[PDB]
Design an enzyme around this catalytic site. Sequence first.
Site, PDB file in Angstrom:
ATOM      1  N   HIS A 155      16.307  37.247  34.231  1.00 30.43           N
ATOM      2  CA  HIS A 155      17.198  37.766  34.238  1.00 30.43           C
ATOM      3  C   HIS A 155      17.839  38.240  35.747  1.00 30.43           C
ATOM      4  O   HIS A 155      17.254  37.436  36.381  1.00 30.43           O
ATOM      5  CB  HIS A 155      17.708  38.901  33.415  1.00 30.43           C
ATOM      6  CG  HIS A 155      17.697  39.761  32.330  1.00 30.43           C
ATOM      7  ND1 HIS A 155      18.252  38.596  31.176  1.00 30.43           N
ATOM      8  CD2 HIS A 155      16.772  39.956  31.309  1.00 30.43           C
ATOM      9  CE1 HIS A 155      18.213  39.307  30.156  1.00 30.43           C
ATOM     10  NE2 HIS A 155      16.762  39.755  30.467  1.00 30.43           N
ATOM     11  N   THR A 204      17.153  42.777  27.321  1.00 34.35           N
ATOM     12  CA  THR A 204      16.665  42.331  27.104  1.00 34.35           C
ATOM     13  C   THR A 204      15.540  41.633  26.909  1.00 34.35           C
ATOM     14  O   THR A 204      14.901  40.976  27.944  1.00 34.35           O
ATOM     15  CB  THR A 204      17.336  41.260  26.277  1.00 34.35           C
ATOM     16  OG1 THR A 204      17.600  40.354  26.786  1.00 34.35           O
ATOM     17  CG2 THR A 204      18.855  41.707  25.492  1.00 34.35           C
ATOM     18  N   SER A 205      14.418  40.984  26.106  1.00 31.90           N
ATOM     19  CA  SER A 205      13.004  40.548  25.947  1.00 31.90           C
ATOM     20  C   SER A 205      14.388  39.027  26.184  1.00 31.90           C
ATOM     21  O   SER A 205      14.287  38.631  25.477  1.00 31.90           O
ATOM     22  CB  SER A 205      12.349  40.461  25.237  1.00 31.90           C
ATOM     23  OG  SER A 205      11.533  42.108  25.465  1.00 31.90           O
ATOM     24  N   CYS A 265      20.831  33.639  35.055  1.00 27.00           N
ATOM     25  CA  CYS A 265      22.138  33.377  35.346  1.00 27.00           C
ATOM     26  C   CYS A 265      22.018  34.046  36.102  1.00 27.00           C
ATOM     27  O   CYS A 265      21.654  34.356  37.331  1.00 27.00           O
ATOM     28  CB  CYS A 265      22.455  34.324  33.585  1.00 27.00           C
ATOM     29  SG  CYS A 265      22.518  35.332  32.701  1.00 27.00           S
TER      30      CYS A 265
END
Lengths: 4, 4, 4, 4, 240, 240, 240, 240
Positions: free
Chosen positions: E93, E34-35, E135
């Site tokens: 990410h 995802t952006s 994350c």
Amino acid sequence: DEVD
Amino acid sequence: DEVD
Amino acid sequence: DEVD
Amino acid sequence: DEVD
Amino acid sequence: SGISLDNSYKMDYPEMGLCIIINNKNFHKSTGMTSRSGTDVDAANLRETFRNLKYEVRNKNDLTREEIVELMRDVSKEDHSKRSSFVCVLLSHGEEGIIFGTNGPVDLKKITNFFRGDRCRSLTGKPKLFIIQACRGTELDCGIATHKIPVEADFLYAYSTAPGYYSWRNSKDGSWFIQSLCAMLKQYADKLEFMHILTRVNRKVATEFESFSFDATFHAKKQIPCIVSMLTKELYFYHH
Amino acid sequence: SGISLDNSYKMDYPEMGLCIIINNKNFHKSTGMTSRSGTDVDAANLRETFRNLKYEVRNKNDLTREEIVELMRDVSKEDHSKRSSFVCVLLSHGEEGIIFGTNGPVDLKKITNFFRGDRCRSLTGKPKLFIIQACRGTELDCGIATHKIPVEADFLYAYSTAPGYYSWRNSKDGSWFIQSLCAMLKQYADKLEFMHILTRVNRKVATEFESFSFDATFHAKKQIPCIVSMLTKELYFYHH
Amino acid sequence: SGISLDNSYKMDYPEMGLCIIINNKNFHKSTGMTSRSGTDVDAANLRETFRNLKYEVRNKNDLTREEIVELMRDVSKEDHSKRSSFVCVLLSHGEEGIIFGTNGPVDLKKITNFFRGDRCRSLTGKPKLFIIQACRGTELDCGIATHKIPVEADFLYAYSTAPGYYSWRNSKDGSWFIQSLCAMLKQYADKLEFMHILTRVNRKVATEFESFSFDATFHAKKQIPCIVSMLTKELYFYHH
Amino acid sequence: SGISLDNSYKMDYPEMGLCIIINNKNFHKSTGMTSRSGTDVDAANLRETFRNLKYEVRNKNDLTREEIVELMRDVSKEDHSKRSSFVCVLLSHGEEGIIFGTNGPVDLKKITNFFRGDRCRSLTGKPKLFIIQACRGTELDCGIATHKIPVEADFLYAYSTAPGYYSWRNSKDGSWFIQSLCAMLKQYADKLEFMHILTRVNRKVATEFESFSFDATFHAKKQIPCIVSMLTKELYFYHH
């Protein structure tokens, strides 16, 4: 003790 | 809120 | 020396 | 300026 | 001269050093990632914060895994003799031990290895700071109501979250960790030692933030950053 | 009263807290693990060091994986209301994220989970320190010539070595890390904040130690400890 | 409990204490003393500054020598058991060791004697601060281009100027010393120990001020305050 | 370079500076002044203490008033460009504002004036410390049971006793103040700022000493030193  |  |  |  | 102490890093070199900010917002469709809405707020906040700390800031956006490795290799090959330290901020990410390029993952060790004491001689003995907003897994914190030196020495990894946990980012305000980090640096960089500033960041993130979600699985979650220090001296951004 | 600050943990409770020392020297033959010569020196040094810091020290020797889990479960179920903090020292063989009982491994997360903010309420908001002298892999450092809170908050993990690396222990003097930690606590516990004491430990281990071995593979190796902080406040062992 | 230190005054009593401000601006014609233009700016600045430090401020204007003595005698007879300290600010004309009531002089020793350790028991062992903005003579600084305790213990005298020298007051901005003192307290009272705050005041007065006068005798003059400490511990206005 | 602060004196010049110790023990019979038994203990203690602080110590014994003035004039005319500070210790009989040569008094102002910012240019902006062990009168403390800069700037006067009071000296152990000062410098010179060290000296003298005399007039008396600071920056004896 003594004083100055 | 969003997670990375 | 030794390692654990 | 002034003195006290 | 008089008695001298060696408890803090020499931060009075001609230059504070480079601050490389890798801001990955848009990912290749094939990755399924995802952006990262709100990351531009983080990147701008960091640029301003480190500019005021006198770092030579270089912002890089949407880099592939190949570009990230090339960039870090090139930066590690520069002459850092006149620089006091090195800072690298990664916004993307991630998973435990991994950061994502726009087209795939990059092992964090691959990135940091370029700066090892034996691989980047002009930075040997100088603080190498890696700030990571990504994350480190998928766990959610439910919270509770209230001579030679090691090649791995002199590194500080300021992780946004604990090992194995997700990291939170607000699409409007930016990430909880970066928002907090910049706020604490702006307020205390001229007063406190770095570890103490990061401890204030831990408290700010831990107490002032909680997720809001329509999905019960992701609602009312908390976060605690993770300071990982291999530093051998105290670090003050100011000198004299 | 006057202006008040909340930057440091309250360490003036009636008791400083417990200091559990798990000293595993002899391992079951079937595990194939070597006897950890010199660990008794570490255990004794730690007992004395923490005694002087006013901790209620409990030394446990050669515990199986089952006994370690039972001990930590029982300790986490005690009433720590009158205690300022909690300290647990683990001396044993290990791998990344693992500590060895005399008969097999125990995940470090299993041990620390008993003390989560939501699982040990009498320790919520108080510093929980885990000091770990054990390997975190097999890498060798060649060196170079010179309201709610997160359940994971308030933990400090003082690892003897960097992620993925072996940890060194001298059969006569004890481990490099524990020797250094005790020396720095004895000298600075009444003067410096804990993170700063640990930074001095990092420098001491990084600069004063180097392995000597007849085996070239293990000779002239270095070590850097790894401070992992999820603390939200400064930690001073003294008060008033 | 754990190890305890006794290096700083206990400032967490229910009340910070009284802050008595004696502001003498208008003097009896017979004394031949001039009106102290700008002193009201000082008095207001002090009232606000100490209010923010949580002191019970009492402002008194144009007191005779008899009223000053009566006031200090009465204040010294109050029960200060629940108070952490005592502060008295004197703004008036003066000479070495003397402060002027509106109708005549008062020996500073007469005022401070009421608070001696043996005469004001509820303040024994507590910091007694006397801030004095008044002349201490007529010298002008030309500058240069760039168990028991003593009854006199626990007093701090923050004099606006060096022994034997005039003290400067601006009719529009207030006195150099009080302006500087309030500015430094507002900026550092929650960060620095009192002696360090006063040292910043010394630097501010010494570097940022210089007299301007059409009279060559009084033109281009400088001033350095004088910190006189009989304190036995460090003094922080904040606690916890 | 990075952000810089100017809160502490530059103490990393090639030399710390001179430490002149004037030890007057024997006085001319005509003065009627007693021999100061125990002063040699003070002089030796000071010599060793300042030697360890890296000061170029010069001990002078039994100087007349003329010799004291000549010495200070000559020292003030030396080139102190490569020196960080200046220290002068006076051990003798005295009265308020006066120190005794072996044949008569010398005004302290006469001595300190040689070092004014405008009279000793190589010391302008540098700390000038005057440590004075001498009486300042005859009062006895009964105790109680428990651009330009000012020419007077950058001076610190560490008086052994409060204004108007006698100062105590033990014939066997040396003076209460010097004993305490040397002990605190030896223990804290590498850890605390000078004003804080002097505050510890105040506490030590105030709490650990009390006179013993067969004469009721001089028995059970106390003493509190008096720190007089015109310093404009913090003073640390160590650097880096």
